[PDB]
Amino acid sequence: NSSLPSLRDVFANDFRIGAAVNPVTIEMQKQLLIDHVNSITAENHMKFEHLQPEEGKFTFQEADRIVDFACSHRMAVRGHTLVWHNQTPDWVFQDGQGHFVSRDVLLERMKCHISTVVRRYKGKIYCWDVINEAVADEGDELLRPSKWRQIIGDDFMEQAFLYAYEADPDALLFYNDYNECFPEKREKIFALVKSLRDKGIPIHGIGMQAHWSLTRPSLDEIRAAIERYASLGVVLHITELDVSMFEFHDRRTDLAAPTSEMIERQAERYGQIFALFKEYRDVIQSVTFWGIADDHTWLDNFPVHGRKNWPLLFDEQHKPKPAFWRAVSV
Ligand SMILES: O[C@@H]1[C@@H](O)[C@H](O[C@@H]2CO[C@@H](O)[C@H](O)[C@H]2O)OC[C@H]1O
Ligand SMILES: O[C@@H]1[C@@H](O)[C@H](O)OC[C@H]1O
Ligand code: NA
């Protein structure tokens, strides 16, 4: 690694380079992080269930540790995430009797959570994924069903962004989602964000999760999505990048190691992806990987539990993979 290029330095004039972490991986992958990234995202510890597990009970310890690490190394921090249909405790939507609360009560709870969380990290966290995955991933409907939407109504996103803006008007607020480059969904995300911005809602950027495969989405689809979203005038962040060795239809669990073909195609894939990101450096301001080395990735258990994936630029021994060389040479 002595003579190895540093990711954040290579892309210094293009965009920040980030990694998703947790207290455990910060220790396990500390040197890689210190040598390559200038942005950090909490993989799980800033989600609702990990910040306010019970009403009035805030558990900022783990998030504080992540922020402390980032700040001690002059790394930016992306806040993830405030309002999402997943990883949110049941108490949030229920009353004493266990029945669903009213619109006003849920809005009060949403405002309280957002205000408390955002104000704590004001000045240390420069952006927040305010709304995560609200758009439907299947069907002809625009929005995915969720307790937030059911109880409050379809304007729940407008409210979330306004509450977050009030809490920290200097933060960049994002709508974050996956499968963001498939045409049908791209148009739903575009329509949603355009509608919000047309109402003056403080949504400053779109977060493209980029949980991609070797084949999907195509480079043309990625280019089209970047251009489509950029045309709204918002900032773009690639937020949870990883390149899975398995396509959606591939649920094999017996592969103990990736084939030389997988490794080679992944290298080509990462080179093509970063070449495209660099081309759009004027609108993309940050590229965060959902991890940093293959010794830790949520793809080991998703969508198939108990297997192994090799989605990042560094291997399990923290050594650069062929993908690393193609990525930094664009
Ligand atoms: O440890 C896992 C996390 O890595 C995972 O993170 C999510 C990945 O999918 C994205 O769409 C989400 O935004 C991101 O939070 O969440 C589940 C957890 O078990
Ligand atoms: O659970 C979600 C999964 O269904 C999607 O494919 O990727 C993002 C995850 O959060
Ligand atoms: Na840029």
Side-chain angles (χ1 to χ4, degrees), residues 262-274:
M262 275 180 262
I263 289 295
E264 181 175 59
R265 172 53 183 150
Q266 182 181 62
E268 178 179 62
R269 178 64 158 164
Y270 263 119
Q272 299 173 316
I273 300 306
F274 274 87

mmCIF file with all atom_site columns, all heavy atoms in Angstrom, residues 262-274:
data_model
loop_
_atom_site.group_PDB
_atom_site.id
_atom_site.type_symbol
_atom_site.label_atom_id
_atom_site.label_alt_id
_atom_site.label_comp_id
_atom_site.label_asym_id
_atom_site.label_entity_id
_atom_site.label_seq_id
_atom_site.pdbx_PDB_ins_code
_atom_site.Cartn_x
_atom_site.Cartn_y
_atom_site.Cartn_z
_atom_site.occupancy
_atom_site.B_iso_or_equiv
_atom_site.pdbx_formal_charge
_atom_site.auth_seq_id
_atom_site.auth_comp_id
_atom_site.auth_asym_id
_atom_site.auth_atom_id
_atom_site.pdbx_PDB_model_num
ATOM 1   N N   . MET A 1 262 ? -15.627 -13.376 -13.007 1.00 0.00 ? 262 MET A N   1
ATOM 2   C CA  . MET A 1 262 ? -16.358 -12.418 -12.182 1.00 0.00 ? 262 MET A CA  1
ATOM 3   C C   . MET A 1 262 ? -15.447 -11.266 -11.787 1.00 0.00 ? 262 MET A C   1
ATOM 4   O O   . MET A 1 262 ? -15.825 -10.099 -11.881 1.00 0.00 ? 262 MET A O   1
ATOM 5   C CB  . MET A 1 262 ? -16.891 -13.090 -10.916 1.00 0.00 ? 262 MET A CB  1
ATOM 6   C CG  . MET A 1 262 ? -18.218 -13.802 -11.084 1.00 0.00 ? 262 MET A CG  1
ATOM 7   S SD  . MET A 1 262 ? -18.770 -14.553 -9.540  1.00 0.00 ? 262 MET A SD  1
ATOM 8   C CE  . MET A 1 262 ? -18.226 -16.230 -9.799  1.00 0.00 ? 262 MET A CE  1
ATOM 9   N N   . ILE A 1 263 ? -14.246 -11.601 -11.331 1.00 0.00 ? 263 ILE A N   1
ATOM 10  C CA  . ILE A 1 263 ? -13.276 -10.593 -10.928 1.00 0.00 ? 263 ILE A CA  1
ATOM 11  C C   . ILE A 1 263 ? -12.922 -9.669  -12.087 1.00 0.00 ? 263 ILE A C   1
ATOM 12  O O   . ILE A 1 263 ? -12.853 -8.449  -11.919 1.00 0.00 ? 263 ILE A O   1
ATOM 13  C CB  . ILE A 1 263 ? -11.983 -11.254 -10.382 1.00 0.00 ? 263 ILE A CB  1
ATOM 14  C CG1 . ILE A 1 263 ? -12.262 -11.892 -9.020  1.00 0.00 ? 263 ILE A CG1 1
ATOM 15  C CG2 . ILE A 1 263 ? -10.864 -10.227 -10.282 1.00 0.00 ? 263 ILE A CG2 1
ATOM 16  C CD1 . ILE A 1 263 ? -12.631 -10.892 -7.932  1.00 0.00 ? 263 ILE A CD1 1
ATOM 17  N N   . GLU A 1 264 ? -12.698 -10.247 -13.264 1.00 0.00 ? 264 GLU A N   1
ATOM 18  C CA  . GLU A 1 264 ? -12.344 -9.457  -14.435 1.00 0.00 ? 264 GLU A CA  1
ATOM 19  C C   . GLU A 1 264 ? -13.483 -8.543  -14.888 1.00 0.00 ? 264 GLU A C   1
ATOM 20  O O   . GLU A 1 264 ? -13.262 -7.369  -15.189 1.00 0.00 ? 264 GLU A O   1
ATOM 21  C CB  . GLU A 1 264 ? -11.932 -10.377 -15.588 1.00 0.00 ? 264 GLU A CB  1
ATOM 22  C CG  . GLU A 1 264 ? -11.518 -9.638  -16.849 1.00 0.00 ? 264 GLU A CG  1
ATOM 23  C CD  . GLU A 1 264 ? -11.005 -10.577 -17.928 1.00 0.00 ? 264 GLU A CD  1
ATOM 24  O OE1 . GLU A 1 264 ? -11.765 -11.472 -18.358 1.00 0.00 ? 264 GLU A OE1 1
ATOM 25  O OE2 . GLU A 1 264 ? -9.841  -10.419 -18.345 1.00 0.00 ? 264 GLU A OE2 1
ATOM 26  N N   . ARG A 1 265 ? -14.698 -9.080  -14.939 1.00 0.00 ? 265 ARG A N   1
ATOM 27  C CA  . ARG A 1 265 ? -15.844 -8.282  -15.353 1.00 0.00 ? 265 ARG A CA  1
ATOM 28  C C   . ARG A 1 265 ? -16.113 -7.184  -14.324 1.00 0.00 ? 265 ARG A C   1
ATOM 29  O O   . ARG A 1 265 ? -16.492 -6.073  -14.687 1.00 0.00 ? 265 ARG A O   1
ATOM 30  C CB  . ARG A 1 265 ? -17.083 -9.169  -15.525 1.00 0.00 ? 265 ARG A CB  1
ATOM 31  C CG  . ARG A 1 265 ? -18.388 -8.407  -15.776 1.00 0.00 ? 265 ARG A CG  1
ATOM 32  C CD  . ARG A 1 265 ? -18.307 -7.418  -16.943 1.00 0.00 ? 265 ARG A CD  1
ATOM 33  N NE  . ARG A 1 265 ? -19.565 -6.679  -17.073 1.00 0.00 ? 265 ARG A NE  1
ATOM 34  C CZ  . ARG A 1 265 ? -19.669 -5.434  -17.532 1.00 0.00 ? 265 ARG A CZ  1
ATOM 35  N NH1 . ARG A 1 265 ? -18.588 -4.768  -17.922 1.00 0.00 ? 265 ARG A NH1 1
ATOM 36  N NH2 . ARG A 1 265 ? -20.859 -4.845  -17.575 1.00 0.00 ? 265 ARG A NH2 1
ATOM 37  N N   . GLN A 1 266 ? -15.904 -7.492  -13.046 1.00 0.00 ? 266 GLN A N   1
ATOM 38  C CA  . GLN A 1 266 ? -16.128 -6.495  -12.000 1.00 0.00 ? 266 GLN A CA  1
ATOM 39  C C   . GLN A 1 266 ? -15.134 -5.352  -12.164 1.00 0.00 ? 266 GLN A C   1
ATOM 40  O O   . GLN A 1 266 ? -15.474 -4.188  -11.949 1.00 0.00 ? 266 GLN A O   1
ATOM 41  C CB  . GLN A 1 266 ? -15.968 -7.112  -10.608 1.00 0.00 ? 266 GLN A CB  1
ATOM 42  C CG  . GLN A 1 266 ? -16.245 -6.116  -9.473  1.00 0.00 ? 266 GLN A CG  1
ATOM 43  C CD  . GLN A 1 266 ? -16.070 -6.731  -8.102  1.00 0.00 ? 266 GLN A CD  1
ATOM 44  O OE1 . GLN A 1 266 ? -14.979 -7.177  -7.744  1.00 0.00 ? 266 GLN A OE1 1
ATOM 45  N NE2 . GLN A 1 266 ? -17.147 -6.758  -7.321  1.00 0.00 ? 266 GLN A NE2 1
ATOM 46  N N   . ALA A 1 267 ? -13.902 -5.686  -12.540 1.00 0.00 ? 267 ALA A N   1
ATOM 47  C CA  . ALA A 1 267 ? -12.878 -4.665  -12.739 1.00 0.00 ? 267 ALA A CA  1
ATOM 48  C C   . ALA A 1 267 ? -13.314 -3.752  -13.879 1.00 0.00 ? 267 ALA A C   1
ATOM 49  O O   . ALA A 1 267 ? -13.263 -2.529  -13.771 1.00 0.00 ? 267 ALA A O   1
ATOM 50  C CB  . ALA A 1 267 ? -11.533 -5.318  -13.059 1.00 0.00 ? 267 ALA A CB  1
ATOM 51  N N   . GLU A 1 268 ? -13.744 -4.357  -14.983 1.00 0.00 ? 268 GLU A N   1
ATOM 52  C CA  . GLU A 1 268 ? -14.203 -3.595  -16.134 1.00 0.00 ? 268 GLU A CA  1
ATOM 53  C C   . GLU A 1 268 ? -15.407 -2.731  -15.758 1.00 0.00 ? 268 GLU A C   1
ATOM 54  O O   . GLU A 1 268 ? -15.486 -1.557  -16.122 1.00 0.00 ? 268 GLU A O   1
ATOM 55  C CB  . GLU A 1 268 ? -14.593 -4.547  -17.263 1.00 0.00 ? 268 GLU A CB  1
ATOM 56  C CG  . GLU A 1 268 ? -15.122 -3.849  -18.497 1.00 0.00 ? 268 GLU A CG  1
ATOM 57  C CD  . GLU A 1 268 ? -15.476 -4.824  -19.597 1.00 0.00 ? 268 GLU A CD  1
ATOM 58  O OE1 . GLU A 1 268 ? -16.376 -5.662  -19.383 1.00 0.00 ? 268 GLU A OE1 1
ATOM 59  O OE2 . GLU A 1 268 ? -14.845 -4.752  -20.672 1.00 0.00 ? 268 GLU A OE2 1
ATOM 60  N N   . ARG A 1 269 ? -16.340 -3.333  -15.031 1.00 0.00 ? 269 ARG A N   1
ATOM 61  C CA  . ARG A 1 269 ? -17.555 -2.657  -14.588 1.00 0.00 ? 269 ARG A CA  1
ATOM 62  C C   . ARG A 1 269 ? -17.226 -1.424  -13.738 1.00 0.00 ? 269 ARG A C   1
ATOM 63  O O   . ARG A 1 269 ? -17.753 -0.337  -13.981 1.00 0.00 ? 269 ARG A O   1
ATOM 64  C CB  . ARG A 1 269 ? -18.408 -3.652  -13.798 1.00 0.00 ? 269 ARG A CB  1
ATOM 65  C CG  . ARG A 1 269 ? -19.694 -3.109  -13.205 1.00 0.00 ? 269 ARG A CG  1
ATOM 66  C CD  . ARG A 1 269 ? -20.688 -2.657  -14.259 1.00 0.00 ? 269 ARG A CD  1
ATOM 67  N NE  . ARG A 1 269 ? -22.032 -2.647  -13.695 1.00 0.00 ? 269 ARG A NE  1
ATOM 68  C CZ  . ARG A 1 269 ? -23.080 -2.033  -14.235 1.00 0.00 ? 269 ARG A CZ  1
ATOM 69  N NH1 . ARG A 1 269 ? -22.953 -1.358  -15.370 1.00 0.00 ? 269 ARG A NH1 1
ATOM 70  N NH2 . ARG A 1 269 ? -24.262 -2.105  -13.637 1.00 0.00 ? 269 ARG A NH2 1
ATOM 71  N N   . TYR A 1 270 ? -16.343 -1.580  -12.755 1.00 0.00 ? 270 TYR A N   1
ATOM 72  C CA  . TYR A 1 270 ? -15.976 -0.445  -11.914 1.00 0.00 ? 270 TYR A CA  1
ATOM 73  C C   . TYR A 1 270 ? -15.254 0.643   -12.707 1.00 0.00 ? 270 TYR A C   1
ATOM 74  O O   . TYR A 1 270 ? -15.434 1.834   -12.447 1.00 0.00 ? 270 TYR A O   1
ATOM 75  C CB  . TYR A 1 270 ? -15.106 -0.901  -10.736 1.00 0.00 ? 270 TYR A CB  1
ATOM 76  C CG  . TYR A 1 270 ? -15.884 -1.115  -9.451  1.00 0.00 ? 270 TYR A CG  1
ATOM 77  C CD1 . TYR A 1 270 ? -15.927 -2.365  -8.835  1.00 0.00 ? 270 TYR A CD1 1
ATOM 78  C CD2 . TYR A 1 270 ? -16.548 -0.054  -8.834  1.00 0.00 ? 270 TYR A CD2 1
ATOM 79  C CE1 . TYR A 1 270 ? -16.605 -2.557  -7.630  1.00 0.00 ? 270 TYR A CE1 1
ATOM 80  C CE2 . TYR A 1 270 ? -17.231 -0.232  -7.632  1.00 0.00 ? 270 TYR A CE2 1
ATOM 81  C CZ  . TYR A 1 270 ? -17.254 -1.483  -7.035  1.00 0.00 ? 270 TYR A CZ  1
ATOM 82  O OH  . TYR A 1 270 ? -17.905 -1.655  -5.835  1.00 0.00 ? 270 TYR A OH  1
ATOM 83  N N   . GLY A 1 271 ? -14.443 0.244   -13.681 1.00 0.00 ? 271 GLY A N   1
ATOM 84  C CA  . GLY A 1 271 ? -13.753 1.235   -14.485 1.00 0.00 ? 271 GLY A CA  1
ATOM 85  C C   . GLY A 1 271 ? -14.741 2.034   -15.319 1.00 0.00 ? 271 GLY A C   1
ATOM 86  O O   . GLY A 1 271 ? -14.622 3.254   -15.439 1.00 0.00 ? 271 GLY A O   1
ATOM 87  N N   . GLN A 1 272 ? -15.720 1.345   -15.899 1.00 0.00 ? 272 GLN A N   1
ATOM 88  C CA  . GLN A 1 272 ? -16.730 1.997   -16.727 1.00 0.00 ? 272 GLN A CA  1
ATOM 89  C C   . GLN A 1 272 ? -17.575 2.941   -15.881 1.00 0.00 ? 272 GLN A C   1
ATOM 90  O O   . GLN A 1 272 ? -17.873 4.060   -16.294 1.00 0.00 ? 272 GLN A O   1
ATOM 91  C CB  . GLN A 1 272 ? -17.628 0.949   -17.390 1.00 0.00 ? 272 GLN A CB  1
ATOM 92  C CG  . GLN A 1 272 ? -16.863 0.008   -18.317 1.00 0.00 ? 272 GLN A CG  1
ATOM 93  C CD  . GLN A 1 272 ? -17.714 -1.130  -18.844 1.00 0.00 ? 272 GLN A CD  1
ATOM 94  O OE1 . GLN A 1 272 ? -18.474 -1.753  -18.100 1.00 0.00 ? 272 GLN A OE1 1
ATOM 95  N NE2 . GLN A 1 272 ? -17.575 -1.424  -20.136 1.00 0.00 ? 272 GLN A NE2 1
ATOM 96  N N   . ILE A 1 273 ? -17.953 2.482   -14.693 1.00 0.00 ? 273 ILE A N   1
ATOM 97  C CA  . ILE A 1 273 ? -18.766 3.284   -13.788 1.00 0.00 ? 273 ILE A CA  1
ATOM 98  C C   . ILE A 1 273 ? -18.050 4.561   -13.367 1.00 0.00 ? 273 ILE A C   1
ATOM 99  O O   . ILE A 1 273 ? -18.620 5.649   -13.437 1.00 0.00 ? 273 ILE A O   1
ATOM 100 C CB  . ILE A 1 273 ? -19.146 2.486   -12.520 1.00 0.00 ? 273 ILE A CB  1
ATOM 101 C CG1 . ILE A 1 273 ? -19.939 1.237   -12.908 1.00 0.00 ? 273 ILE A CG1 1
ATOM 102 C CG2 . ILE A 1 273 ? -19.959 3.353   -11.581 1.00 0.00 ? 273 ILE A CG2 1
ATOM 103 C CD1 . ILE A 1 273 ? -21.143 1.518   -13.765 1.00 0.00 ? 273 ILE A CD1 1
ATOM 104 N N   . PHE A 1 274 ? -16.803 4.438   -12.927 1.00 0.00 ? 274 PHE A N   1
ATOM 105 C CA  . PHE A 1 274 ? -16.075 5.623   -12.510 1.00 0.00 ? 274 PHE A CA  1
ATOM 106 C C   . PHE A 1 274 ? -15.727 6.554   -13.657 1.00 0.00 ? 274 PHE A C   1
ATOM 107 O O   . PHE A 1 274 ? -15.598 7.759   -13.460 1.00 0.00 ? 274 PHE A O   1
ATOM 108 C CB  . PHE A 1 274 ? -14.843 5.252   -11.678 1.00 0.00 ? 274 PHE A CB  1
ATOM 109 C CG  . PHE A 1 274 ? -15.158 5.087   -10.217 1.00 0.00 ? 274 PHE A CG  1
ATOM 110 C CD1 . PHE A 1 274 ? -15.597 3.864   -9.716  1.00 0.00 ? 274 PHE A CD1 1
ATOM 111 C CD2 . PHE A 1 274 ? -15.110 6.182   -9.361  1.00 0.00 ? 274 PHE A CD2 1
ATOM 112 C CE1 . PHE A 1 274 ? -15.991 3.735   -8.380  1.00 0.00 ? 274 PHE A CE1 1
ATOM 113 C CE2 . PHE A 1 274 ? -15.502 6.065   -8.027  1.00 0.00 ? 274 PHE A CE2 1
ATOM 114 C CZ  . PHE A 1 274 ? -15.942 4.840   -7.537  1.00 0.00 ? 274 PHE A CZ  1
#
